[PDB]
Design an enzyme around this catalytic site. Structure first.
Site, PDB file in Angstrom:
ATOM      1  N   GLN A   1       8.314  -8.118   8.019  1.00  0.00           N
ATOM      2  CA  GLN A   1       9.751  -8.149   7.848  1.00  0.00           C
ATOM      3  C   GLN A   1      10.362  -7.138   8.813  1.00  0.00           C
ATOM      4  O   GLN A   1       9.808  -6.050   9.009  1.00  0.00           O
ATOM      5  CB  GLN A   1      10.095  -7.785   6.420  1.00  0.00           C
ATOM      6  CG  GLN A   1       9.691  -8.832   5.405  1.00  0.00           C
ATOM      7  CD  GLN A   1      10.254  -8.492   4.053  1.00  0.00           C
ATOM      8  OE1 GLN A   1      11.440  -8.645   3.837  1.00  0.00           O
ATOM      9  NE2 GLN A   1       9.419  -7.977   3.157  1.00  0.00           N
TER      10      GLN A   1
ATOM     11  N   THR B   1      -0.216  -6.087   3.306  1.00  0.00           N
ATOM     12  CA  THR B   1      -0.655  -7.480   3.269  1.00  0.00           C
ATOM     13  C   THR B   1      -0.717  -8.066   4.677  1.00  0.00           C
ATOM     14  O   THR B   1      -1.700  -8.696   5.058  1.00  0.00           O
ATOM     15  CB  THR B   1       0.292  -8.352   2.442  1.00  0.00           C
ATOM     16  OG1 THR B   1       0.513  -7.721   1.181  1.00  0.00           O
ATOM     17  CG2 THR B   1      -0.292  -9.771   2.254  1.00  0.00           C
ATOM     18  N   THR B   2       0.339  -7.835   5.435  1.00  0.00           N
ATOM     19  CA  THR B   2       0.499  -8.372   6.792  1.00  0.00           C
ATOM     20  C   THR B   2      -0.604  -7.937   7.774  1.00  0.00           C
ATOM     21  O   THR B   2      -0.946  -8.672   8.740  1.00  0.00           O
ATOM     22  CB  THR B   2       1.872  -7.953   7.308  1.00  0.00           C
ATOM     23  OG1 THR B   2       2.870  -8.342   6.328  1.00  0.00           O
ATOM     24  CG2 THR B   2       2.191  -8.594   8.676  1.00  0.00           C
TER      25      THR B   2
ATOM     26  N   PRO C   1       4.908 -21.066   6.220  1.00  0.00           N
ATOM     27  CA  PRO C   1       4.055 -21.080   5.025  1.00  0.00           C
ATOM     28  C   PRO C   1       2.848 -20.136   5.186  1.00  0.00           C
ATOM     29  O   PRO C   1       2.391 -19.864   6.312  1.00  0.00           O
ATOM     30  CB  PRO C   1       3.578 -22.541   4.934  1.00  0.00           C
ATOM     31  CG  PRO C   1       4.502 -23.338   5.812  1.00  0.00           C
ATOM     32  CD  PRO C   1       5.147 -22.410   6.787  1.00  0.00           C
TER      33      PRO C   1
ATOM     34  N   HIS D   1      11.153   2.990  -3.683  1.00  0.00           N
ATOM     35  CA  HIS D   1      10.501   2.065  -2.759  1.00  0.00           C
ATOM     36  C   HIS D   1      10.996   2.132  -1.317  1.00  0.00           C
ATOM     37  O   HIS D   1      10.224   1.871  -0.397  1.00  0.00           O
ATOM     38  CB  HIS D   1      10.661   0.634  -3.274  1.00  0.00           C
ATOM     39  CG  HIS D   1       9.800  -0.360  -2.564  1.00  0.00           C
ATOM     40  ND1 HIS D   1       8.425  -0.328  -2.629  1.00  0.00           N
ATOM     41  CD2 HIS D   1      10.117  -1.402  -1.763  1.00  0.00           C
ATOM     42  CE1 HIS D   1       7.929  -1.302  -1.896  1.00  0.00           C
ATOM     43  NE2 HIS D   1       8.934  -1.975  -1.367  1.00  0.00           N
TER      44      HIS D   1
ATOM     45  N   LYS E   1      10.933  -2.981   8.839  1.00  0.00           N
ATOM     46  CA  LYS E   1       9.913  -1.967   9.103  1.00  0.00           C
ATOM     47  C   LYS E   1      10.014  -1.370  10.510  1.00  0.00           C
ATOM     48  O   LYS E   1       9.428  -0.321  10.779  1.00  0.00           O
ATOM     49  CB  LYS E   1       8.509  -2.542   8.872  1.00  0.00           C
ATOM     50  CG  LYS E   1       8.268  -3.055   7.461  1.00  0.00           C
ATOM     51  CD  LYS E   1       6.802  -3.398   7.247  1.00  0.00           C
ATOM     52  CE  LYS E   1       6.525  -3.997   5.884  1.00  0.00           C
ATOM     53  NZ  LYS E   1       5.084  -4.292   5.700  1.00  0.00           N
TER      54      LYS E   1
HETATM   55  C1  12V Z   1       6.236  -2.129   1.766  1.00  0.00           C
HETATM   56  C2  12V Z   1       5.426  -2.926   0.704  1.00  0.00           C
HETATM   57  O1  12V Z   1       5.830  -3.030  -0.454  1.00  0.00           O
HETATM   58  N1  12V Z   1       4.244  -3.442   1.094  1.00  0.00           N
HETATM   59  C3  12V Z   1       3.387  -4.195   0.136  1.00  0.00           C
HETATM   60  C4  12V Z   1       1.956  -3.538  -0.084  1.00  0.00           C
HETATM   61  O2  12V Z   1       1.927  -2.053  -0.098  1.00  0.00           O
HETATM   62  C5  12V Z   1       1.330  -4.010  -1.400  1.00  0.00           C
HETATM   63  O3  12V Z   1      -0.043  -3.662  -1.387  1.00  0.00           O
HETATM   64  C6  12V Z   1       1.465  -5.569  -1.712  1.00  0.00           C
HETATM   65  C7  12V Z   1       1.639  -5.500  -3.240  1.00  0.00           C
HETATM   66  O4  12V Z   1       1.506  -6.775  -3.887  1.00  0.00           O
HETATM   67  S1  12V Z   1       2.684  -6.577  -0.829  1.00  0.00           S
HETATM   68  C8  12V Z   1       3.251  -5.713   0.631  1.00  0.00           C
HETATM   69  O5  12V Z   1       2.488  -6.004   2.083  1.00  0.00           O
HETATM   70  P1  12V Z   1       3.429  -6.184   3.327  1.00  0.00           P
HETATM   71  O6  12V Z   1       2.667  -6.227   4.619  1.00  0.00           O
HETATM   72  O7  12V Z   1       4.507  -5.191   3.234  1.00  0.00           O
HETATM   73  O8  12V Z   1       4.124  -7.628   3.190  1.00  0.00           O
HETATM   74  P2  12V Z   1       5.485  -7.985   2.405  1.00  0.00           P
HETATM   75  O9  12V Z   1       5.407  -7.281   1.129  1.00  0.00           O
HETATM   76  O10 12V Z   1       6.664  -7.809   3.269  1.00  0.00           O
HETATM   77  O11 12V Z   1       5.281  -9.541   2.180  1.00  0.00           O
HETATM   78  C9  12V Z   1       5.246 -10.436   3.282  1.00  0.00           C
HETATM   79  C10 12V Z   1       4.546 -11.690   2.783  1.00  0.00           C
HETATM   80  O12 12V Z   1       4.970 -12.774   3.630  1.00  0.00           O
HETATM   81  C11 12V Z   1       3.738 -13.467   4.008  1.00  0.00           C
HETATM   82  N2  12V Z   1       4.180 -14.158   5.232  1.00  0.00           N
HETATM   83  C12 12V Z   1       4.610 -13.426   6.336  1.00  0.00           C
HETATM   84  C13 12V Z   1       5.039 -14.092   7.474  1.00  0.00           C
HETATM   85  C14 12V Z   1       5.064 -15.477   7.478  1.00  0.00           C
HETATM   86  O13 12V Z   1       5.463 -16.122   8.449  1.00  0.00           O
HETATM   87  N3  12V Z   1       4.664 -16.176   6.356  1.00  0.00           N
HETATM   88  C15 12V Z   1       4.221 -15.506   5.261  1.00  0.00           C
HETATM   89  O14 12V Z   1       3.828 -16.193   4.340  1.00  0.00           O
HETATM   90  C16 12V Z   1       2.696 -12.397   4.157  1.00  0.00           C
HETATM   91  O15 12V Z   1       1.357 -12.979   4.083  1.00  0.00           O
HETATM   92  C17 12V Z   1       3.016 -11.597   2.920  1.00  0.00           C
HETATM   93  O16 12V Z   1       2.427 -12.198   1.779  1.00  0.00           O
END
Ligand code: 12V
Lengths: 695, 7
Positions: A507, A589-590, A565, A184, A510
């Site tokens: 996060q 996701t972001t 949240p 990962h 990255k």
């Molecule tokens: C590198 C990696 O693994 N990537 C994965 C993808 O490849 C997969 O498809 C996904 C699989 O389920 S998840 C994942 O997507 P990523 O963009 O990396 O986000 P990450 O995993 O760090 O979560 C941040 C969360 O905080 C939430 N978030 C963020 C900021 C905030 O202030 N509040 C909040 O709720 C956000 O809404 C997010 O829900």
């Protein structure tokens, strides 16, 4: 010495991955010599590897009773307790092992990792340094340390760290040992593709080794759909049916499947967390099975097989909660990676990876063990239309003489509220209502300025966007749609009313030196503007601020807010002008989150699945002008959006509309395309053929 | 707490 040779043999049979044989040999060692502390401890460690945690614990204790100062037994016992969720017991063991022998590097390393897991990165770093001071050749600790430093954006001696990580991996691969870089994380480091694939492969292998103790014959697989009444039985396997990004992306998919042609089984690897996400998938899947209740992977795999699954879908890859042992046992004829893991499994037991042309160009099929299975637009999906429909439309308050992102209102009942107001003007973009600066507008701004929770206007509930958990905590998590009108402002986050806001809500891990250098260049070219980042985690902030100060940026150019949240995080992206994506690992996701707010995202696709997801999103969205083929282009695009304001307005208008009119957030369309792809996968195999690229 | 993708 009879006992020793049994023990030593066992140790090697274990190094080899011959777990069953190792166990037998340790037992024989103890039959020969019952008071053999080392054999108890070793036996305990291999019982632990097999999930027999109570039995292990009993042998660790016998080992310690025989030798009260056996620091190694305490250290490994600590790992068993940690596996059992007994963090306090684990700490008690680690700290006892360090008290016994303060020069015991492994114990320091284990302690560091429980510090990390608990959210104490500074103490984790300190303990990994002690470990490496005590034993400078310690791959696991070096690489774990490297990840901690990554998380907090500590780039001290970065380039040497990076090639140090590469050589460590090369060496470990050479010697056929398990690489200390977790699959990962392999995307974060400048490893070759062969190395990334190899790392994954070797981790896949641990699962194969664990299942051979069971000795299962292969499973026999359906060749047609006759006993399923002409329905393709699809099994979604995930530890993330609950409050997790995965569910935030795909919770609607199971229930949108066409039951005339598909029969959907969701296999959860997690217990029910009590959230609406879990409730929804349980309710809408044709069948829901909680495999967290069936921890033996033999019995769990049997269940999958009797259910009659044709396509088993791996939603974890190498993420927390995975049970890829289940896929190693091949209980279904077609096994596919989908959505949860942004990389290759490197494993034989997975047939396809669901992806797309932009994310995984055909040219790079080398990089994956799996065959490419292309969705027609992006493989990415988000449940935003269902979770946050209150963000489909917005209004603003015209604080001066007109901005789309300074003071924003959203709500299911926003239209009715606006219709209650005397002087609303409508700006065509379809349209954006504007509340002029009257007594109403003043009452709203005063609630915000005073940090009040809510007010009432004309009988409508008007909520402060910073207070959603106090008003309805299920609406804050995205489990319920807010039932009030919410106000969101730049002032709430100390953002400037009169400048460009570039944002990135990922996060901090990255981000890398090259990336922050791009951002600083962009900001220098656009005076006024700010970069809006998150304390994710907070201890990363002064590192970022320092490296930016050294690039010539005054401090006020980067503004940090807390993690919010879920609903507030998505809503507040409406305040930004532009999102600057992380090229090393994109928003996934972001990225969906920021686009749902109408915020354009500038990205530069790279050489890993993880660095190309944003570009795929944007392609599906139909905004090719936001995809950079290099750093100069990324900066130019970004500077253009922050200076050419009519172009900014155009591009924002396009994102705002295309988030609805494009396929990106259209879960029904996605599901239907996913269904075509599933049937292609099924024909190709029913016709006796075997996995091949699908494009 | 905010859940995220982790190794
Ligand atoms: C590198 C990696 O693994 N990537 C994965 C993808 O490849 C997969 O498809 C996904 C699989 O389920 S998840 C994942 O997507 P990523 O963009 O990396 O986000 P990450 O995993 O760090 O979560 C941040 C969360 O905080 C939430 N978030 C963020 C900021 C905030 O202030 N509040 C909040 O709720 C956000 O809404 C997010 O829900």
């Amino acid at each position: 010495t009879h006992a020793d040779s049994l023990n030593n043999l066992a140790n090697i049979k274990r190094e080899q991955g011959n777990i069953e044989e190792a166990v037998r040999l340790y037992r024989k060692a103890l039959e020969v010599f019952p008071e053999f502390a080392a054999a108890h401890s070793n036996l305990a460690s291999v019982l632990q590897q097999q999930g027999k945690l109570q039995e292990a614990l009993m042998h660790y204790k016998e080992a310690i009773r025989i030798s009260p100062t056996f620091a190694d037994a305490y250290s490994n016992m600590g790992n068993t307790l940690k596996e059992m969720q007994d963090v306090q017991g684990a700490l008690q063991c680690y700290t006892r092992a360090i008290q016994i022998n303060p020069a015991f590097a492994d114990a320091h390393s284990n302690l560091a990792s429980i510090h990390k897991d608990s959210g104490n990165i500074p103490e984790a770093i300190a303990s990994y340094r002690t470990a490496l001071k005590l034993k400078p050749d310690f791959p696991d600790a070096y690489c774990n340390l490297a990840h901690c430093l990554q998380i907090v954006c500590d780039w001290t001696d970065y380039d040497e760290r990076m090639k140090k990580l590469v050589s460590i991996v090369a060496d470990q691969l050479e010697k056929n040992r398990l690489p200390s870089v977790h699959p990962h994380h392999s995307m974060l480091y400048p490893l070759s593709h062969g190395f990334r694939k190899a790392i994954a492969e070797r981790h896949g292998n641990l699962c194969l080794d664990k299942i051979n103790v069971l000795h299962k014959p292969p499973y026999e697989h359906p060749k047609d759909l006759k006993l399923s009444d002409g329905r393709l039985r699809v099994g979604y396997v995930s530890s993330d049916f609950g409050n997790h990004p995965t569910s935030h992306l795909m919770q609607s998919i199971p229930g949108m499947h066409n039951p005339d042609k598909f029969e959907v089984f969701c296999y959860a690897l997690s217990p029910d967390d009590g959230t609406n996400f879990r409730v929804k998938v349980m309710a809408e899947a044709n069948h829901f099975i909680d495999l967290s209740q069936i921890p033996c992977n033999g019995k769990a795999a049997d269940r999958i097989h009797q259910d009659g699954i044709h396509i088993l879908v791996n939603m974890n890859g190498y993420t927390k909660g995975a049970r890829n042992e289940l896929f190693a046992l091949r209980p279904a004829p077609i096994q596919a990676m989908w959505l949860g893991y942004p990389g290759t499994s490197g494993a034989l037991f997975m047939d396809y990876i669901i992806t797309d042309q932009e994310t995984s160009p055909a040219e790079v099929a080398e990089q994956y063990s799996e065959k490419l299975a292309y969705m027609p637009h992006t493989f990415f999906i988000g449940d935003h239309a269902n979770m946050f429909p209150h963000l489909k439309k917005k209004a603003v308050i015209d604080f001066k003489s007109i901005y789309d992102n300074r003071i924003v209102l959203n709500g299911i009942d926003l239209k009715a509220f606006l219709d209650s107001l005397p002087d609303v003007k409508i700006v065509k973009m379809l349209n954006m209502p504007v509340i002029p600066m009257n007594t109403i507008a003043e009452a709203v701004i005063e609630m915000i300025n005073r940090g009040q929770i809510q007010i009432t206007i004309n009988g409508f509930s008007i909520s402060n966007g910073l207070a959603t958990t106090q008003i309805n905590n299920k609406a804050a998590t995205g489990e319920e749609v807010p039932r009030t009108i919410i106000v969101t402002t730049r002032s709430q986050y100390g953002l400037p009313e009169d400048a460009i806001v570039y944002c990135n809500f990922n996060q901090l891990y990255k981000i890398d030196p090259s990336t922050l250098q791009m951002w600083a260049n962009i900001l220098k070219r656009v005076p006024n503007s700010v970069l809006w980042l998150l304390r994710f985690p907070a201890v990363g902030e002064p590192n970022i601020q320092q490296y930016a100060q050294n690039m010539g940026l005054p401090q006020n150019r980067i503004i940090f807010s807390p993690v919010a949240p879920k609903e507030e995080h998505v809503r507040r992206g409406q305040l930004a002008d532009v999102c600057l994506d992380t090229p090393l690992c994109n928003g996934h996701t972001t990225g969906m989150d920021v686009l749902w707010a109408g915020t354009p995202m500038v990205t530069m696709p790279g050489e890993t699945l993880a660095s190309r997801v944003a570009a795929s999103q944007l392609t599906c969205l139909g905004c090719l002008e936001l995809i950079a083929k290099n750093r100069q282009e990324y900066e130019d695009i970004a500077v253009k959006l922050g200076t050419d304001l009519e172009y900014l307005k155009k591009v924002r208008g396009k994102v705002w509309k295309q988030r609805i009119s494009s396929p990106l957030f259209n879960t029904k369309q996605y599901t239907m395309e996913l269904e075509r792809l599933y049937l292609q996968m099924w024909e190709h195999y029913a016709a006796g053929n075997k996995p091949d690229h699908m494009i | 707490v905010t859940p995220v993708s982790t190794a």
